[PDB]
Coordinates of C-alpha atoms in Angstrom, one line a residue:
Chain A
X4 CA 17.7 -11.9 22.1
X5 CA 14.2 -11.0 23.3
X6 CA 12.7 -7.8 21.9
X7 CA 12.5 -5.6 25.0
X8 CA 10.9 -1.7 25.8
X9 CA 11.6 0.9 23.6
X10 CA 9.4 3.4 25.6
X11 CA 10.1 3.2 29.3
X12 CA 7.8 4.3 31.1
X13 CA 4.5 3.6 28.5
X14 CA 2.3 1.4 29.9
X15 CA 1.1 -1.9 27.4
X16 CA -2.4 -1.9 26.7
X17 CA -4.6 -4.4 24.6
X18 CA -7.4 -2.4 23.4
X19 CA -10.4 -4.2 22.1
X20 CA -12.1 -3.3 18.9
X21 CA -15.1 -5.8 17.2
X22 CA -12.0 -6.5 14.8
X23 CA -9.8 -7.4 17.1
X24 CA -7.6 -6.6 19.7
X25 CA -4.8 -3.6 19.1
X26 CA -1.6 -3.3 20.7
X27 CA -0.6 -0.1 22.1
X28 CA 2.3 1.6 24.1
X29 CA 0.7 4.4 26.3
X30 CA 2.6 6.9 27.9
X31 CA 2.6 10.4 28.8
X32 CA -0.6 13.0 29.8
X33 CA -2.6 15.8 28.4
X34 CA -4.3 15.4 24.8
X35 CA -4.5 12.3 23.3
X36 CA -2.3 12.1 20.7
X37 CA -2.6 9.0 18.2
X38 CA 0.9 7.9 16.1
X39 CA 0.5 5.0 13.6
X40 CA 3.3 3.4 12.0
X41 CA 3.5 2.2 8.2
X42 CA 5.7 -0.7 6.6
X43 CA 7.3 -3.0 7.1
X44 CA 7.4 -1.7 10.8
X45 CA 5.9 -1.7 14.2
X46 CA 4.7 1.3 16.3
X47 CA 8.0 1.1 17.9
X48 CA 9.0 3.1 14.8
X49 CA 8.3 5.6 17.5
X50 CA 10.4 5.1 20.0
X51 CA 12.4 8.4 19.3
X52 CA 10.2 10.5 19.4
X53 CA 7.5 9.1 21.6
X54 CA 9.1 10.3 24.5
X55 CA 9.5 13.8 23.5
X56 CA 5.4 13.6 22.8
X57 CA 5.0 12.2 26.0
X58 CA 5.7 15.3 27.6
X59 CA 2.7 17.2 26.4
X60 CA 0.2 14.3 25.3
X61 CA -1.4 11.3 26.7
X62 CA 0.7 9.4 23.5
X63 CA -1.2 6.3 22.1
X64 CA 1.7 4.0 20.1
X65 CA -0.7 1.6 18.1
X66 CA 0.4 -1.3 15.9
X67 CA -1.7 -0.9 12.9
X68 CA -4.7 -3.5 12.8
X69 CA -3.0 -6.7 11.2
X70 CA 0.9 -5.7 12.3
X71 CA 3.1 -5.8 15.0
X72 CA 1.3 -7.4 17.9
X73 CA -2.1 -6.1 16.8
X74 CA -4.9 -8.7 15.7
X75 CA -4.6 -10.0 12.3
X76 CA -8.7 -9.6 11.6
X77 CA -9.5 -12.2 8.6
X78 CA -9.3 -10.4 5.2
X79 CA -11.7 -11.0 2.4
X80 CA -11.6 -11.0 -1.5
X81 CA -11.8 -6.9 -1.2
X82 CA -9.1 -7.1 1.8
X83 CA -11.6 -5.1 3.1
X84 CA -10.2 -5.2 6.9
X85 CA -6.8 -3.6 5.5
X86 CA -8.3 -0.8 3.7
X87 CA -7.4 2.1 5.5
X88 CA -11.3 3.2 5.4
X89 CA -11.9 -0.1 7.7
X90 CA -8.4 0.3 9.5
X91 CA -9.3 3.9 10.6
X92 CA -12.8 2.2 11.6
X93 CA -11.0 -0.2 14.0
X94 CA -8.6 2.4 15.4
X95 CA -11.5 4.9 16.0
X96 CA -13.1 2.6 17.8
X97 CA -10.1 1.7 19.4
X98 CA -9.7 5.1 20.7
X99 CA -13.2 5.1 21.6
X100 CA -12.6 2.2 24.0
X101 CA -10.1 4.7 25.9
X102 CA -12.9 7.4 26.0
X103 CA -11.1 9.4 23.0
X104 CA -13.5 10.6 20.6
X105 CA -11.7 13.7 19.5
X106 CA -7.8 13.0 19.2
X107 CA -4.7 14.3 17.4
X108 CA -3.0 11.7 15.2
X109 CA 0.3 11.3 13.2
X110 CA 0.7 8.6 10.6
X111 CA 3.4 7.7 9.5
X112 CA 3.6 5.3 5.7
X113 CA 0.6 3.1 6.1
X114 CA -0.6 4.6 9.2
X115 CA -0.5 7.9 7.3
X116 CA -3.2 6.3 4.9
X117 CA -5.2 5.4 7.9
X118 CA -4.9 8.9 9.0
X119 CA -5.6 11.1 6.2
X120 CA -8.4 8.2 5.0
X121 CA -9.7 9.2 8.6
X122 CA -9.7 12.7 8.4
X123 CA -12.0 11.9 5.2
X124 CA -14.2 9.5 6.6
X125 CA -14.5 10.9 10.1
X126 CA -12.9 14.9 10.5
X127 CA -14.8 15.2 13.5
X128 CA -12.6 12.3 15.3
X129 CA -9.2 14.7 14.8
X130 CA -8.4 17.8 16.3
X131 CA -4.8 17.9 14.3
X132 CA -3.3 15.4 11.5
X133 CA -0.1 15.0 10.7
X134 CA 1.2 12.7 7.9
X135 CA 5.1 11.9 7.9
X136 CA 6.5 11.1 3.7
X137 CA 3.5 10.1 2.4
X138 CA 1.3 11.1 -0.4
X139 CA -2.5 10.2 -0.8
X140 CA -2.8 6.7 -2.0
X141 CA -4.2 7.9 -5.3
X142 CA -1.6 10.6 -6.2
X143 CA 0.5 7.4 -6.4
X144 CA -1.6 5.5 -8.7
X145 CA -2.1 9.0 -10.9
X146 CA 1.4 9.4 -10.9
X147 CA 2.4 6.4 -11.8
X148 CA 5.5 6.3 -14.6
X149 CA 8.5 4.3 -15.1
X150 CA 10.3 6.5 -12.8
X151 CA 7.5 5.6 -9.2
X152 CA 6.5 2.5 -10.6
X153 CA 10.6 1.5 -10.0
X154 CA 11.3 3.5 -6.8
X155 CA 8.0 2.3 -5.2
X156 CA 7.8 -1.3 -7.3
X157 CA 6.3 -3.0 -4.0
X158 CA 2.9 -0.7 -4.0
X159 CA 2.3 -3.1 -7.2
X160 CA 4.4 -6.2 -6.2
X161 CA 3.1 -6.8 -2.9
X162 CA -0.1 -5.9 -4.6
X163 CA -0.3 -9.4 -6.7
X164 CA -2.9 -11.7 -5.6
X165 CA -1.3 -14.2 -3.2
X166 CA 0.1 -16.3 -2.8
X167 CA 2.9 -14.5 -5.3
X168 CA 3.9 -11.7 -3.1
X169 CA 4.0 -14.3 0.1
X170 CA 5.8 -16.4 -1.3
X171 CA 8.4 -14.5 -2.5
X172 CA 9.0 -12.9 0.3
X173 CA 9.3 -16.2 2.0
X174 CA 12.2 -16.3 0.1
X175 CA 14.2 -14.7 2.5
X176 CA 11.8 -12.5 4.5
X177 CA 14.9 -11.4 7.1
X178 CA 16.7 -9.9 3.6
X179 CA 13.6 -8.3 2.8
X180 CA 12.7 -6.6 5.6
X181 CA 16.2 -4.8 6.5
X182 CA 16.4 -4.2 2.5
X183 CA 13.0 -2.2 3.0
X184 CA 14.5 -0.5 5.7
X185 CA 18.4 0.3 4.4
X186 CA 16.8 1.1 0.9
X187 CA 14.4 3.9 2.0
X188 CA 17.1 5.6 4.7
X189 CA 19.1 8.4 3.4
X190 CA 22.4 6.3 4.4
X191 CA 21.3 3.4 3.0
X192 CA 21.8 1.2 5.4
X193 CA 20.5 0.3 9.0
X194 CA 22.6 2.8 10.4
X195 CA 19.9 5.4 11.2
X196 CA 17.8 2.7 13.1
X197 CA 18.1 1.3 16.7
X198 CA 19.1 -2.3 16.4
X199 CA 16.8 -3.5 18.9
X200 CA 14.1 -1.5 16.8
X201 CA 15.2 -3.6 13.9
X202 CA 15.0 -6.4 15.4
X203 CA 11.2 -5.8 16.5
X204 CA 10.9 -4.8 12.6
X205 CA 12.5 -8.6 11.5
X206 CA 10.7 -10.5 14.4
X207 CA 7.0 -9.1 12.7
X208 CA 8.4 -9.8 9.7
X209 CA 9.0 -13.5 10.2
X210 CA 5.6 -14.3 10.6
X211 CA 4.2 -15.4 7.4
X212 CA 0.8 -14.1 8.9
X213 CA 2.7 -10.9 9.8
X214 CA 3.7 -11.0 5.8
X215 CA 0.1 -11.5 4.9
X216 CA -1.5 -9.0 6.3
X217 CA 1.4 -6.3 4.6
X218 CA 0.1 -7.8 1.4
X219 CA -3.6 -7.3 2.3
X220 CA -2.7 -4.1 3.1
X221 CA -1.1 -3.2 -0.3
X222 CA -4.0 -5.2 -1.9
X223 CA -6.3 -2.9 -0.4
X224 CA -3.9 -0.1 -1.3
X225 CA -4.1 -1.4 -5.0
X226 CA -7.8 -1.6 -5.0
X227 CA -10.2 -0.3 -2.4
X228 CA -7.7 2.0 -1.1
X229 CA -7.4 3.8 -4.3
X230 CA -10.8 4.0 -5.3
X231 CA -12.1 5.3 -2.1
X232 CA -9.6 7.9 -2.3
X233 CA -10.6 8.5 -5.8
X234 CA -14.5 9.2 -4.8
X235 CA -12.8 12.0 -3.0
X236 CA -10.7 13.5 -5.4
X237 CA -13.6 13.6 -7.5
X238 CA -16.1 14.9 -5.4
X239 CA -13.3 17.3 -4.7
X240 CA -13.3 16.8 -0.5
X241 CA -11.1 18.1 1.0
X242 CA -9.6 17.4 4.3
X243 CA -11.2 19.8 6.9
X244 CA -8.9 19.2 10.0
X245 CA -5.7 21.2 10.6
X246 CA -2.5 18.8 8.7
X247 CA 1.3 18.5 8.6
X248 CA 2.2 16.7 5.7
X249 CA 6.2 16.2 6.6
X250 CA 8.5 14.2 4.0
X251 CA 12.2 13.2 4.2
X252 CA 14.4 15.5 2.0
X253 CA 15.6 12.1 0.2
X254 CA 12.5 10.2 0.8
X255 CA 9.4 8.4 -0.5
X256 CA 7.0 11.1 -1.5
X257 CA 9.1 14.2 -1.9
X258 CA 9.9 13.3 -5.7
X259 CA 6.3 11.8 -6.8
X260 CA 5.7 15.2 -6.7
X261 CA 6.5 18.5 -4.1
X262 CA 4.2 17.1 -1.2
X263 CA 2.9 20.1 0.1
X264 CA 1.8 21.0 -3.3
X265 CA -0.2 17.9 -3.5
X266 CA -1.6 18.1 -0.4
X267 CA -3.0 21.6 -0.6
X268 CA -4.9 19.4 -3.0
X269 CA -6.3 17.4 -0.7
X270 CA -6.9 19.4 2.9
X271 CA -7.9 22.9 2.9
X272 CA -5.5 23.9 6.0
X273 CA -2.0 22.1 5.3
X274 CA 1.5 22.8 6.2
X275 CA 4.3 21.2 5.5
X276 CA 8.1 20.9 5.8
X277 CA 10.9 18.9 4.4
X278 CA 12.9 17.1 6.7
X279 CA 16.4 15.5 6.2
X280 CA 15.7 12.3 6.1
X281 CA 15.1 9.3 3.9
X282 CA 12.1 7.6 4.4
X283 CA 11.8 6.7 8.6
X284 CA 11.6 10.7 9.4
X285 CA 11.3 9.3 13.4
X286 CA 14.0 7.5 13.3
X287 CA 16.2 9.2 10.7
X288 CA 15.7 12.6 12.1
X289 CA 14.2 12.3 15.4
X290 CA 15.0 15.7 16.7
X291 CA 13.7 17.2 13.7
X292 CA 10.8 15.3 13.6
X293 CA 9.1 15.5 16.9
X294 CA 10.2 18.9 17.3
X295 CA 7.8 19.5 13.9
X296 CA 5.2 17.5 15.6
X297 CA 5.3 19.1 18.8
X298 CA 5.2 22.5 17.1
X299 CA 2.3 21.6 15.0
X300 CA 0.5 20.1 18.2
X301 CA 1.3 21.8 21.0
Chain B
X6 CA 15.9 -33.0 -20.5
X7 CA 13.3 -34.4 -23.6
X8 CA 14.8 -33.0 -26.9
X9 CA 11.8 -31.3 -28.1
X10 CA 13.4 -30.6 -31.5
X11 CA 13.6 -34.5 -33.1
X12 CA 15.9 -34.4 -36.2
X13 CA 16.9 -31.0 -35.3
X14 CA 21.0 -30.5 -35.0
X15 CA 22.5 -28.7 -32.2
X16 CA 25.3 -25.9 -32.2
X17 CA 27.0 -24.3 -30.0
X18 CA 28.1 -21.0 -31.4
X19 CA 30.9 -19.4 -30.0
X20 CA 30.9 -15.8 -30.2
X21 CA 32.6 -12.8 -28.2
X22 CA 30.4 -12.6 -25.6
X23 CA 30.0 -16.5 -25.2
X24 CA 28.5 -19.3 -26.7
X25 CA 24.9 -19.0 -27.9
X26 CA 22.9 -22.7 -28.4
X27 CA 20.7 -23.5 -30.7
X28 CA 18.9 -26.1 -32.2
X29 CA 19.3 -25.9 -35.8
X30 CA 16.8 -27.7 -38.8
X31 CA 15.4 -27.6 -41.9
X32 CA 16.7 -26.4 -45.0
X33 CA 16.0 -23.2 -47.1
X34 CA 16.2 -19.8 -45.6
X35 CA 17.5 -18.8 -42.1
X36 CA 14.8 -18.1 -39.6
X37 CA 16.0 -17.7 -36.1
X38 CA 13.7 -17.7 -33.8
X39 CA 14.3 -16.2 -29.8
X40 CA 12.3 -17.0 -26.9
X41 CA 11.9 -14.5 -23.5
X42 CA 11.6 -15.3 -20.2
X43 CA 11.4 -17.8 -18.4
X44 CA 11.8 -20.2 -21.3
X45 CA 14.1 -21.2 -23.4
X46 CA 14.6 -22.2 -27.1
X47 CA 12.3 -24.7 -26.4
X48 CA 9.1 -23.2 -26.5
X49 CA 9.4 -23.4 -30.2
X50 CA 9.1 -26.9 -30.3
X51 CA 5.6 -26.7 -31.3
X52 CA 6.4 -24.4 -34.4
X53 CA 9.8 -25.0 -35.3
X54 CA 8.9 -28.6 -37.2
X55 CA 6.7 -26.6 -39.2
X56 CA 8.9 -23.8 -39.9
X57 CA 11.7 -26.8 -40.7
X58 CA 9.7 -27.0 -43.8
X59 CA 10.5 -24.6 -45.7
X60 CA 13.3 -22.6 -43.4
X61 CA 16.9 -23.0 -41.8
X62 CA 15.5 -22.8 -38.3
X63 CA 18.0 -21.3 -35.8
X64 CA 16.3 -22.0 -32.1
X65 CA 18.7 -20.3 -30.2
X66 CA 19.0 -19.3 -26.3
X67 CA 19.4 -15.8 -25.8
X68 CA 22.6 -15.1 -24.6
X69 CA 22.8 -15.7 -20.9
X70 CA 19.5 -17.8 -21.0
X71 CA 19.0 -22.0 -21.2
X72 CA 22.4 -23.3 -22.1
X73 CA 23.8 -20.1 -23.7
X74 CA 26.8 -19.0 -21.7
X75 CA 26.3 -15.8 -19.2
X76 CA 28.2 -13.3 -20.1
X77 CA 29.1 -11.4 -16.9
X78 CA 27.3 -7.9 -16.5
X79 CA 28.2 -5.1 -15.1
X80 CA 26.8 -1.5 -13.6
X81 CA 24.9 -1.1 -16.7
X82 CA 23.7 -4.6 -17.6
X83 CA 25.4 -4.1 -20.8
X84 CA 25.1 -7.7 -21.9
X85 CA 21.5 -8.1 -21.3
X86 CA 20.5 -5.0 -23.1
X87 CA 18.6 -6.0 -26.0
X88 CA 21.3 -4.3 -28.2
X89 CA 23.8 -6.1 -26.9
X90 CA 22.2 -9.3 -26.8
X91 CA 21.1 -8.3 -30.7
X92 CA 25.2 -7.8 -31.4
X93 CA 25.9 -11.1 -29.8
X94 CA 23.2 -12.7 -31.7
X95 CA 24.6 -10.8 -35.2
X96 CA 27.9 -12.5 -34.0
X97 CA 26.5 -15.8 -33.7
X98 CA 24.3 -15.9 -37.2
X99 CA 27.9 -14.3 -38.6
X100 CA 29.4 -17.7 -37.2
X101 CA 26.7 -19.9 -39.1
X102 CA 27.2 -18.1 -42.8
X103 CA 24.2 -15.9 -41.8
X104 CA 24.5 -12.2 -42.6
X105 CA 20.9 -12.1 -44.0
X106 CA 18.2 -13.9 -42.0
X107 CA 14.5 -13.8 -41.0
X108 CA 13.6 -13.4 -37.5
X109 CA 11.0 -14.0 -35.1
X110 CA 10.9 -13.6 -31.1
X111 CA 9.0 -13.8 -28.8
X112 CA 9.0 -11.6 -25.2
X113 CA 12.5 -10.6 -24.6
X114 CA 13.5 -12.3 -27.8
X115 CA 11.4 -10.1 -29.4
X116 CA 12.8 -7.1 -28.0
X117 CA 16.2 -8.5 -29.0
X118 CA 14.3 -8.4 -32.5
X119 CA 12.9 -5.2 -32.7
X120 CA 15.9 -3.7 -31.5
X121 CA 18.4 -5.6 -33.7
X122 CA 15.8 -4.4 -36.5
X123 CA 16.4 -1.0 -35.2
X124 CA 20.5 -1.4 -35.1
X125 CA 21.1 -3.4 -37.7
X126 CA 18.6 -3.3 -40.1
X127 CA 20.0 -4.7 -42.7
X128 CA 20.7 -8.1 -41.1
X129 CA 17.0 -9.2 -41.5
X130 CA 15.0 -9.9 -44.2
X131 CA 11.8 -10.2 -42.3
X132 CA 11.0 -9.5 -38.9
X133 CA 8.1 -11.4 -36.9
X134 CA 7.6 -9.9 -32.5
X135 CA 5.1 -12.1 -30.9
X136 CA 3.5 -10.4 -28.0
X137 CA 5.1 -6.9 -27.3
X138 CA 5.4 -3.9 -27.6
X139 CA 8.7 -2.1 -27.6
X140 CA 9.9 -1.5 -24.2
X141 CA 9.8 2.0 -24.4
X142 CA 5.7 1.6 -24.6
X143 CA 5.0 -0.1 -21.9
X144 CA 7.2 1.8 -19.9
X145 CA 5.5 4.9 -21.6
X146 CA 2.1 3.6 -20.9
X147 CA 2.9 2.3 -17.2
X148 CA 0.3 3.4 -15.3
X149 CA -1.8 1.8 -11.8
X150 CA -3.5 -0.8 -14.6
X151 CA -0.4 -1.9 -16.1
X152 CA 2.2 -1.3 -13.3
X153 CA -0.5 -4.5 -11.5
X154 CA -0.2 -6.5 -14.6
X155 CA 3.0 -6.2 -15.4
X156 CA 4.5 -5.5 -11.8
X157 CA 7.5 -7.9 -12.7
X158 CA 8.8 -5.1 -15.0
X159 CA 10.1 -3.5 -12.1
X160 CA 9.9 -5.9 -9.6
X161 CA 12.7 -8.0 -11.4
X162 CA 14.5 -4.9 -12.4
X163 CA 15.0 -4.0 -8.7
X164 CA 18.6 -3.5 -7.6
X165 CA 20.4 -7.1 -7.2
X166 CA 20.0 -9.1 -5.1
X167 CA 16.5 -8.1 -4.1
X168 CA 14.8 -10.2 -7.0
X169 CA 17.5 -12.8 -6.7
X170 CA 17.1 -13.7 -3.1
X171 CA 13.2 -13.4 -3.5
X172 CA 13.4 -15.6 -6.3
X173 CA 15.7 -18.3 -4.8
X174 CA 13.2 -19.5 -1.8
X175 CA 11.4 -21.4 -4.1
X176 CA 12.8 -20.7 -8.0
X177 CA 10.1 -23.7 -9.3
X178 CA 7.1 -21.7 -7.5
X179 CA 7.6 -18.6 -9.6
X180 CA 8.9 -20.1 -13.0
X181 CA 5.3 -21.7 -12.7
X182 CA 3.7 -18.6 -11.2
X183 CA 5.0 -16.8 -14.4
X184 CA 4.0 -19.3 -17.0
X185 CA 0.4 -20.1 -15.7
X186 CA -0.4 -16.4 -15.0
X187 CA 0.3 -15.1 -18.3
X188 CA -1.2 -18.3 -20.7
X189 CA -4.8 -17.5 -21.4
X190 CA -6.3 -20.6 -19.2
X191 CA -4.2 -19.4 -16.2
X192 CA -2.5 -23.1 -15.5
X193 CA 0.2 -24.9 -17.4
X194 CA -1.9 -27.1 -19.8
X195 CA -0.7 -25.4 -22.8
X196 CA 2.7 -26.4 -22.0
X197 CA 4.3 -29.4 -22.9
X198 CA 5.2 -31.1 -19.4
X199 CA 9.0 -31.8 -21.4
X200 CA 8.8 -27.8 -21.9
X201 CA 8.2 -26.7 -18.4
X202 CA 11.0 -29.1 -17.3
X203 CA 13.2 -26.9 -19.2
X204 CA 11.9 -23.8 -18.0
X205 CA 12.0 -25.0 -14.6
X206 CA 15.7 -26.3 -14.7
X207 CA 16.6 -23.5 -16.2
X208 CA 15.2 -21.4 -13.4
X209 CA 16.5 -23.4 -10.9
X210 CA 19.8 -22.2 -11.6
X211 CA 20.5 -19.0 -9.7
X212 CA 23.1 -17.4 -12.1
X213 CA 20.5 -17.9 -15.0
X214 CA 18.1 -16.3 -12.7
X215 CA 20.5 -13.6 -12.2
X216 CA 20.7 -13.0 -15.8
X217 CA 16.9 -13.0 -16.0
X218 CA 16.9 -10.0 -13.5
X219 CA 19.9 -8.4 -16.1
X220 CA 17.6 -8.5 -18.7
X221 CA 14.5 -7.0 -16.7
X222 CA 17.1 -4.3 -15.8
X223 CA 18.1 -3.5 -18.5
X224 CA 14.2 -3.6 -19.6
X225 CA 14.6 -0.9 -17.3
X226 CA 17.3 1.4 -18.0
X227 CA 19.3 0.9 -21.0
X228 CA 17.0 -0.8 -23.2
X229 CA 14.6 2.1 -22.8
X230 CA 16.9 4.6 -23.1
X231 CA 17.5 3.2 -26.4
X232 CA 13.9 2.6 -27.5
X233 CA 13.3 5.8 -26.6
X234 CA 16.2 7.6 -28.7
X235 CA 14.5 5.9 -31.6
X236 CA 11.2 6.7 -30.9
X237 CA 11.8 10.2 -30.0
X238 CA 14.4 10.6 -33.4
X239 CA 11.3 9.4 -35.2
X240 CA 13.5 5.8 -36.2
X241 CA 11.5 3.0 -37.6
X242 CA 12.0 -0.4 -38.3
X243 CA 12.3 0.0 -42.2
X244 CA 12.3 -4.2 -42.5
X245 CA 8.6 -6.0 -43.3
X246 CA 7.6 -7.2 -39.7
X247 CA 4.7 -9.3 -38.5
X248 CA 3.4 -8.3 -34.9
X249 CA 1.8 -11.5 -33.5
X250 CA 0.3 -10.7 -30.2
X251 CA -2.5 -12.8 -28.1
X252 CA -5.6 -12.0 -28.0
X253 CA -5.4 -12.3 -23.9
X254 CA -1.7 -11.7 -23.9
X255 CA 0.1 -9.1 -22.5
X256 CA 1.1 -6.8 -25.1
X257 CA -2.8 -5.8 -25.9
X258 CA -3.4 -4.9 -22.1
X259 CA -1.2 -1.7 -22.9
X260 CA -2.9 -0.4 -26.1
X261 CA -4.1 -1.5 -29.5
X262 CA -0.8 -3.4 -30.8
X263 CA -0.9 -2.8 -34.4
X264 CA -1.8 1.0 -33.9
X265 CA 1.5 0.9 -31.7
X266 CA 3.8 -0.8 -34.2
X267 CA 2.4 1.2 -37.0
X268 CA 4.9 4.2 -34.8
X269 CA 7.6 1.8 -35.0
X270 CA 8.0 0.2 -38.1
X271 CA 7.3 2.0 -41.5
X272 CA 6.1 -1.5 -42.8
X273 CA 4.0 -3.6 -39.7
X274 CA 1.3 -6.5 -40.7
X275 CA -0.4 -7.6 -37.5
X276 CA -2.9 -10.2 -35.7
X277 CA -3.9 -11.4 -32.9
X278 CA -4.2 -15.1 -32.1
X279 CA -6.5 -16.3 -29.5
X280 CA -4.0 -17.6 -26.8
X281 CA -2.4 -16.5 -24.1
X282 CA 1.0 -14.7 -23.8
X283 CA 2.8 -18.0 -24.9
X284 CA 2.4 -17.8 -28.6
X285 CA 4.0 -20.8 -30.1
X286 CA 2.6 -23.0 -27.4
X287 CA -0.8 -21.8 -26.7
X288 CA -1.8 -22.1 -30.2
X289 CA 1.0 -23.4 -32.1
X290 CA -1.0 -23.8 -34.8
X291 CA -1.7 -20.7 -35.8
X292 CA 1.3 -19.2 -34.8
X293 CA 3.1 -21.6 -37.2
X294 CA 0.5 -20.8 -39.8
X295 CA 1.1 -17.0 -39.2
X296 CA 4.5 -17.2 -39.4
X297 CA 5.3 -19.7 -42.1
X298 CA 2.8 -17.4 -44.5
X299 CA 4.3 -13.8 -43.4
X300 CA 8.1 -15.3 -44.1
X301 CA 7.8 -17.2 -47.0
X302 CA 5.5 -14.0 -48.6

């Protein structure tokens, strides 16, 4: 049962960044066009809506530092190398290394915290953002109540200091992952997803170093993560670069608040749109989805 | 298992909902005296010979937990709601002769307390909670701080079987996660080595560990539903209560506990202990101290 190409046509490339290598599907001409994935999947989250990308932008498919087949850089007491600051460090430079210093990107979950903690850090790097079902990492925290810290219990659970999280999900890490999936779909189940997709999704999840990094990440998320973001709510920046902030009708973010509501908070040039959808918008609602992003791109 | 509870008697006590056990000594009037999770009547060990002194100690498993039966549950965790568990505990004290007791509990024992304090008031004589608030407040004050600290509150109260297949990898690793990370030095010395066995074995069973996710689901849902009738009705526990709570427990990491329980009970002495969440083992001591004083005022 090997995992197999979800993009025909993309080319494979290793691109090299001083924190390792990351993985990337490359396919399609035009402007480079950056899509990030989130948790607890791989860029081949993309897979639907890759293709229709392809046909107007040079698409770069990156695994996240730390995921997917992406170099797991060695994290530190502040998990400083998952942060999304340092994450959309490494993926800058990644870019970079394929002569892109101006690019359009859509993030997706965690890569959506890279992205909009890149537009922060670096606005001259994007020439369009778009963030699929997220809110800023620091909405989450503010807005945390019974009712978020229940539907999104893993922001503080993977959060604990390992080797709690890690080994708990080495309970039964297969369970876990589809459980992640099912749970934040608007069926429910793994219906909406392409099994070999899953499968991709369960075979990253099996590596305890795989699991690891996910933690780091929502360490960082817990910690650095927030208070990064939180310098910039307070200094009131804003995000300069043209965003989408899209959001499953059913999703993650829609009901921590109305997303484009919060965003206007944070980037002075936002639109936004439901989509129905649970949580995966590209894999959920793929037509919807890319058509949004193509729209918003062009 | 040790018995921890030398010249104590033990009962099973058969009521609607199943059997409750305790460990019963002493003489004089009836204390009974709940743990939380993940222990079992046996972290009283330390106290209970003291309380024998001058009280009928009841050292019961909460329904569900140690060697109490598991009542099934259902859509709404009915019997792991704290007033359920309260009812079934009522039951149980009825079986003994005991329509009038003291009580003291600790984690989700207290929260069986304050809430049978808040149903049935007239059951207790005196209350005691070591090391909560009521549900209702830490869900109320659940914020980025607290959700870290406390993230089991909804981790375990996620939809079965998430917590239960997490759990069951490696049931003795998170038992001991639990009880380390919430003592004040971080690592099981304050436990009696006989004690943890019981916690562990306990936890090693994945039906009680099932029921342990009830509760925390309930901790969820019902019993803050119900918490939060009282609290927004204005009810308040009209019975004398102590609130124990440890100085590095987990109860003060949500707000000033006294100030708390002052909303909640028209009648609230309180004090800190230096220890850790664990109370009656930490600093038994002075938990026994507290608590021998407060009931036999």
């Amino acid at each position: 049962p090997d995992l197999a190409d979800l993009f025909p046509g993309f080319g494979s490339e290793w691109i090299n960044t001083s924190s390792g290598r990351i993985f990337a599907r490359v396919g399609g001409d035009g402007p480079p066009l950056l899509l990030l994935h989130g948790f607890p999947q791989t860029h081949v989250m993309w897979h639907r809506v890759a293709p229709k990308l392809a046909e107007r932008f040079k698409v770069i498919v990156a695994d996240l530092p730390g995921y997917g087949w992406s170099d797991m850089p060695e994290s530190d007491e502040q998990h400083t190398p998952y942060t999304k600051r340092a994450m959309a460090k490494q993926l800058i430079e990644a870019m970079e290394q394929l002569g892109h210093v101006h690019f359009a990107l859509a993030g997706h979950d965690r890569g959506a915290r890279v992205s909009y903690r890149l537009a922060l850090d670096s606005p001259g790097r994007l020439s369009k953002l778009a963030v699929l079902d997220i809110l800023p990492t620091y909405e989450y925290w503010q807005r945390m109540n019974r009712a978020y810290a229940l539907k999104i219990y893993h922001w503080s659970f993977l959060a604990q200091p390992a080797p709690l999280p890690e080994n708990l999900l080495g309970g039964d890490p297969d369970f876990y992952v589809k459980a992640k999936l099912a749970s934040w779909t608007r069926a429910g189940d793994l219906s909406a997803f392409d099994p070999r997709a899953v499968e991709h999704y369960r075979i990253a999840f099996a590596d305890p170093m795989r699991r690891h990094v996910m933690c780091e990440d929502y360490r960082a998320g817990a910690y650095a993560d927030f208070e990064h973001d939180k310098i910039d709510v307070e200094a009131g920046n804003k995000i300069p670069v043209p965003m989408l902030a899209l959001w499953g009708a059913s999703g993650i973010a829609q009901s921590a608040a109305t997303p484009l509501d919060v965003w206007r908070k944070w980037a002075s040039d936002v639109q936004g749109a439901p989509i129905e959808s649970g949580h995966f918008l590209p894999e959920e609602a793929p037509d919807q989805t890319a058509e949004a992003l193509v729209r918003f791109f062009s």
